[PDB]
Amino acid sequence: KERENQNKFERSTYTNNQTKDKKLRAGLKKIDEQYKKAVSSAAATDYLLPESNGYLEPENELEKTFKVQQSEIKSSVDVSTANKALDLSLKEFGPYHIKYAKNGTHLLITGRKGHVASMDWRKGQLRAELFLNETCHSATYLQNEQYFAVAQKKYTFIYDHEGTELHRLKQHIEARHLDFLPYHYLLVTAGETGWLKYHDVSTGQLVSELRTKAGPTMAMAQNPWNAVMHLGHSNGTVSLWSPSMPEPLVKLLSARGPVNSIAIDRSGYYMATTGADRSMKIWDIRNFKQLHSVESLPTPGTNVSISDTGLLALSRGPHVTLWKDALKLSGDSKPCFGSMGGNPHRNTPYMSHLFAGNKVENLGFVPFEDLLGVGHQTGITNLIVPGAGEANYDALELNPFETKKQRQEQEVRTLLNKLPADTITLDPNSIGSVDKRSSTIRLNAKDLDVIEEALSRF
């Protein structure tokens, strides 16, 4: 009943800053008993969890972890993971924006010149290779490998599984950043116009057009927790947006200069933003505190990414550098680059790699595996990062081994339980409650000159 890992499974509630009703008293007592039983029994599943997370540990004081080479990892790990660590050398079209499907089964690469390829990177099956000879910028899958949206010269296009064009969106005028919201079925679009557009993929209907009013959108990320969009502008300002409010939900002053990249944890708690002022900044999202401010990077961080197990992958051109346990509150988790004299209270890099020829275009962790796919000027490279993936997925949220029938039925079922775009709030648990107006107690309709003293009476 005690369960040393309950507070992961606990659930916050409302507080005022007991009752005389017998029936209501016993009803609330049954509700508290059921909540305790449910938390305990849900937290006892960690016995049933099949796999264990990966790691790499130094076992010596001369053996630092950032100086461990990718060939040495590929020798030290098994043949299946060594074959997952792919490398495509696609030289002639431009730097390749990488994208993985939400289970790690499909890869979607876009060249800057025109070359968009959707493929099953772990078999050898490509299912779309289309050369759209205008400058493409980004792409994403929608709810499947079966549809993907590409952001072209101006218009965003939507292609089916084999690459036939389904849609040319006449809105979404100049996208540079696309991201799909999978529980809400919303393709979110931002770019050189100062506008943020939410487009419902299922109905086909443009849900929202929002003026950023801050020029072109330099970075864009999605909170996986509550589906609000963090856009980074040329002010050094991140703004958190929802498709209901025509104003940003929050505006944070992250950096000086512009904001080069944003990444959010999948728990929706931490956000790493890199500015062009050579400054990485780790942010608390829920309480909006600034946790860490790594200033004076040697060159501006062009990308950040956060794995499912909380690694932090920063990329500064040729270099990729990953820190472990950097998204924590304490000042001993501030990511350093060296430990001055061997200080154990300095978060040196967990591992680093140098793409010596080129400058990396973007970063993306492969979802349920221990790999980091970085797309760069001459194609794709996966890196075996051992701490970097949820070993125990849930197979009824999203399954890496899913079949054709399972894809069909899961598509219909998630389409059926698509969440409305109005339910996107800054916290997800605020659509069962009562108003923050409409008084917290329910109402019971019962509650619904001594002369002048004489001259008074006149």
Partner: protein, 273 residues
Amino acid sequence: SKTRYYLEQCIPEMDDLVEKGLFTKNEVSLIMKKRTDFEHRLNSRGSSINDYIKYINYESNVNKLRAKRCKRILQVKKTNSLSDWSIQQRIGFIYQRGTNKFPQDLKFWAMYLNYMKARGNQTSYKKIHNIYNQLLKLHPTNVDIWISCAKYEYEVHANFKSCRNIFQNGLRFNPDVPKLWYEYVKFELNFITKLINRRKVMGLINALRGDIALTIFDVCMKTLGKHYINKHKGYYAISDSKMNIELNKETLNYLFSESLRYIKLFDEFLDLE
């Protein structure tokens, strides 16, 4: 899914089995992933009684390892907590599930009965009675189950009334195999021999005869003759009197050969008259 239900029914015993400091978390996760494999193979499609049997063998092996580790770590022979009966209860439930799914392999039914009998004082003889009742309901014609049921309830419990009831019900169902007749006359001779030997013993310390065996001998001859004349010449009596007398002669040969075997294994009961 129901594999999820069974797998999370398995968790309180390993709660207790980690608290009693004999197993660790990394090895109990290994026994849970093996048990996950087995539960999924059990309640998925295309299932096999060999999947049931291998699950029972795995659960008995982890029970023996648990007993060995308990004696080596805690130096007691049972912790008198949940984790010393839960796994035998699991084996009994795997047996019950398997016999409800494939009630056709008497090898598995008899492995169930053997494990349930050999469980010892912890089981209940009415729990053995229940699975004898449903097995005899499903296989009334298979006669070795009747012999085994009555043999368990006479040669272990010495319950003469219930043993007589079992033999009379079996002879009601299949009064055609002579083996059940011979085991009934064997049981009646054993019962009357134990009766007269307890008489001799109470005499030496301090009416009811083999005529029961003779009467069941008489109805054995009559009904075995009737069932052989009904079994051979099967559909109709379309046979002339040559074939009818040939048949009746052959049933006399059959029945008299069985009575020859009756006297041949009747001579060795030499403690009564």
